[PDB]
């Protein structure tokens, strides 16, 4: 599960 792999651009 990637939650920080997206919070970067989000």
Explain the overall architecture.
The structure is a monomer. With 10 residues, this protein is mainly alpha-helical. Helices cover 40% and strands 0% of the residues. The chain has one helix at 4-7. It is classed as hormone/growth factor. Keywords: neuromedin B, hormone-growth factor complex.
List the helices and strands and how they pair.
Blueprint: H1 4-7
**What is the CA–CA distance across the termini?**
16 Å
Which geometry do the CA atoms define? elongated
Radius of gyration: 6 Å
Strand tally: 0
H/E element sequence:
H
Q: Bin the strand percentage.
A: under 5%
Helix percent band:
40-55%
Instruction: Give me the number of helical elements.
Output: 1
Main beta-sheet strand count, sense and barrel state:
none
Structural class by SSE content: mainly alpha
């Amino acid at each position: 599960g990637n939650l920080w792999a997206t919070g970067h651009f989000m």
